[PDB]
Design a binder for these strands. Structure first.
Length: 474
DNA sequence: TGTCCCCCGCGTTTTAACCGCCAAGGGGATTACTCCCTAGTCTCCAGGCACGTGTCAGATATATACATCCTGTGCATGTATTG
């Protein structure tokens, strides 16, 4: 794709380009880590030829990942052959792999590993959908969030990654899961951790990179990788388009390929949805309120044929996520976790996750005081017969045996006596009350949650535009 | 308490003090005298002292402008370790 030049080479950012030849783009990033000996270092290499004058150069820059480091610019006055030689020689020295056949890369212990990078207007639409698309399709905000994913929360310091790089990361998490499952904290565990930290760049400052020892860190790493994938899909979706759009967002909307229609505030549907939002605000999430500003009808192509209409127990359940990634869902729908992803990160397995209490799912929006706009999606989910779970058991999926979804039994939850109906789907109104489920052996889940596995059992139905209103801070 | 060097103990080498004596004459030491300077006298008056007197230099706040002490603080730097 679009090949960017490292901006840090100020002497060449505007007069020079990264070299390419078909497949082979002479740009590469290497990472190494060995917690046994506490190495965690990167090495970027880029061949740049000037645009204006015929002159090639090799740029190298190295240091601890996150902390910018020592750089070198070697000019050649157009000696492309020597420069390419130097490039390949250094690549081999640092990797033990030849550069030209980069396709068949094999990392070796005690050497750097490679990684893979991404380097007449009649705007006819309802004004409300226009505001929605402009909100979610704001490329500036996506860039700013990506920059925050490097300098605010150091999860991806050096840059972005590819889908396949994420898949290799998942492979390493699988190896970590296998290792940890046997509770052995010796040498193999340290090497597996080395492989993880090699594939996904982290910045530990100086404190020896710690061993991944419990399930919580596994799941956190998994969520980090998921956020990486989300950013990747969001930037893939926001690709701009030409051909007389007179409002490029209309093509972006086609890319959503999902009808989203404005609803009137006085319609039964709007009022009932507001009732459901308000009645189900958990009392233990009282640091903020939420107001329903607007509500949009959802019609996603292909989902109708897939819905398990035959299955009973159909209810409308929440799903929250940050303002930016929603563009992906509306174009592709919700997906089960990556198969290559370790099962043991999900205390009750993979699949699609929903709540019936607005604030619990709403916590996954990460709205802010400065940025007070968030979205909650409502979907009709045919749960069918639920399997009842008292205590965490990541293996819930084997226990289904004919059931179609899992229920995690929370202390606080609405009782079916208050349930209402919307278009023949069950709407589980609150308030939450005690459910008389308790555990005389272990802990008790704070709140119920429902998980489905077949993607065909979800049908998105309305998208909620929500003002999160925070309060006094001191 | 520790250091180290400088002063002590001692035998040695060199020098001039000391011892014994002599000799020259400058000046100390003696004598006599004489005159002028001071003692002695007396007189006279103004310098100098006791007593008054007034003011301004200095004594007494008084407020003021530093100058000083004292403590705390933030920081460029010495060390650690890595690419």
């Amino acid at each position: 794709g679009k090949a960017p030049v490292d901006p840090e080479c100020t002497a060449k950012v505007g007069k020079a380009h990264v070299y390419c030849e078909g497949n082979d783009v002479y740009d590469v990033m290497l990472n190494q880590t060995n917690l046994q000996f506490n190495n965690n270092k990167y090495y970027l290499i880029q061949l740049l030829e000037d645009d204006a004058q015929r002159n090639f150069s090799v740029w190298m820059r190295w240091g601890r990942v996150g902390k910018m480091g020592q750089h070198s610019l070697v000019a050649c006055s157009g000696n492309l052959n020597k420069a390419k030689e130097i490039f390949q020689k250094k690549f081999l020295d640092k990797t033990k792999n030849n550069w030209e056949d980069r396709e068949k890369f094999e990392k070796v212990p005690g050497k750097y590993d490679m990684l893979q990078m991404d380097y007449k207007p009649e705007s006819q639409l309802d004004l409300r959908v226009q505001e929605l698309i402009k909100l979610i399709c704001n490329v500036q905000a996506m860039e700013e969030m990506m920059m925050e994913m490097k300098y605010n929360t150091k999860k991806a310091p050096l840059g972005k990654l590819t889908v396949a790089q994420i898949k290799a990361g998942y492979q390493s998490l699988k190896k970590i899961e296998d290792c940890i499952r046997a509770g052995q904290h010796g040498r193999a565990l340290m090497e597996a951790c080395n492989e993880f930290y090699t594939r996904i760049p982290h910045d530990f400052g100086l404190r020896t990179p710690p061993l991944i020892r419990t399930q919580k860190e596994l799941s956190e790493k998994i969520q980090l990788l998921e956020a990486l994938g989300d950013i990747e899909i969001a930037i893939k979706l926001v690709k701009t388009e030409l051909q007389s759009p007179e409002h490029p967002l209309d093509q972006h909307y086609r890319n959503l390929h999902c009808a989203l229609r404005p609803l009137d505030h006085e319609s039964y549907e709007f009022k009932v949805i507001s009732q459901y939002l308000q009645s189900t605000h958990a009392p233990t999430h009282s640091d903020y309120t939420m107001t329903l500003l607007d509500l949009f009808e959802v019609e996603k192509d292909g989902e109708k044929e897939a819905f398990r209409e035959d299955l009973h127990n159909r209810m409308l359940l929440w799903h929250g996520s940050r303002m930016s990634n929603w563009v992906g869902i509306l174009s592709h729908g919700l997906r089960i976790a990556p198969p290559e992803a370790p099962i043991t990160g999900y205390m009750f397995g993979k699949g699609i996750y929903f709540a019936d209490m607005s604030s619990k799912s709403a916590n996954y929006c990460f709205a802010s005081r400065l940025k007070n706009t968030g979205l909650l999606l409502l979907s009709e989910v045919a749960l069918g017969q639920c399997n009842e779970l008292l205590e965490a058991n990541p293996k819930a999926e084997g226990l289904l045996q004919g059931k179609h979804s899992t229920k995690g039994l929370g202390k606080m939850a609405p009782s079916s006596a208050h349930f209402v109906t919307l278009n023949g789907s069950t709407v589980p109104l609150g308030p939450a009350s005690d459910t008389g489920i308790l555990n005389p052996d272990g802990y008790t889940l704070n709140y119920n949650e429902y998980i489905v596995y077949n993607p065909n059992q979800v049908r998105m139905r309305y998208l909620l535009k929500v003002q999160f209103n925070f309060l006094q801070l001191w």
